[PDB]
Point group: C2
């Protein structure tokens, strides 16, 4: 029945509601969230820019991208076969940082919010060219330490090393099963005209 | 400034626990030891009973039964004081404070912490240790000292150990 689950789109073409910041303003932000790059594009669509401009020695920087404008979202049924997919490319290459999810459970008094994380390098080796990466949910959200996949609020990016860096994201979303995207068996001028 | 007594002679409302029950608790809070006394009063026993590999053990001691407490005027010259002594010695763990701010979306609760080894070397005899609040609550973290809810004790190493606290409180000038 997870196969009838629709994709959960986190970023497509516009500013995402959430909060991004750092101790000394190392992380580039606007309106306290990630800026949308209209110059570096993918498939003609704008990208999401994660830009740590100076060496990070405030100790930290974080980026929270909400799935439902801060409300919780039930993702339990995406865990056993789903993935976190997105395309990325670095300014140079070899960029690395923490990536995961955060939940919210008001009834867990010893910690209202818990995060599950991993390093992006474990699933890709960022280059200067676009790459499509798939992180598997079951690899993150396989608890025992409190995380509640039925109460997820945000996706998270976070400091790994203090090195400054820049990457661009595209088509960030949550899938329930596994795919190989595709395209019609068509011409660009199916339809006679081209939209 | 008025003192903010955290522990004196009775169970503290809060939540203490661990991934697999390594931390000795009762009613999900730290046991009050009545055989180990000091200055006539009972003591608070923090006891992880086995090499802990849940990943974690934590103790939240509320200052106001979960309500936030205003400790802003205490940051400058305030201290967190208490007396301590261990079962074997050299015991070390994380100690700090946790706040609660519902409208701060990037983190409803934030912890400001340090390790006791930075302030004292636990011996098998009573010892008094004063940690300046300025050493913890002075950050561009978003941590709000006027919204503090709990004192925190948490895992540092997976090694089991036992310590007793006494007269835990917050004092100023």
């Amino acid at each position: 029945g997870y196969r009838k689950l629709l994709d959960v789109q986190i970023f497509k073409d516009s500013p995402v509601v959430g909060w991004s910041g750092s101790g000394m303003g190392e992380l580039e932000t606007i309106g306290d969230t990630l800026p949308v790059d209209t110059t570096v594009t993918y498939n003609g669509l704008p990208t999401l820019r994660l830009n740590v401009q100076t060496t990070v020695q405030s100790g930290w920087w974080i980026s929270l991208l909400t799935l439902r404008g801060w409300n919780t979202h039930d993702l339990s049924q995406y865990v056993e076969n789903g993935y976190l997919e997105f395309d990325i490319k670095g300014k140079e290459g070899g960029e690395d940082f923490v990536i995961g999810f955060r939940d919210k459970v008001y009834e867990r008094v010893y910690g209202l919010e818990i995060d599950v994380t991993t390093v992006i390098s474990n699933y890709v080796t960022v280059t200067t060219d676009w790459q499509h990466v798939k992180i598997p949910l079951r690899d993150l959200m396989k608890i025992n330490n409190g995380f509640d996949p039925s109460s997820v609020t945000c996706l998270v990016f976070s400091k790994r090393y203090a090195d400054p860096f820049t990457v661009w994201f595209s088509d960030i979303k949550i899938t329930s099963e596994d795919n190989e995207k595709s395209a019609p068996a068509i011409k660009v001028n199916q339809l006679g005209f081209i939209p």
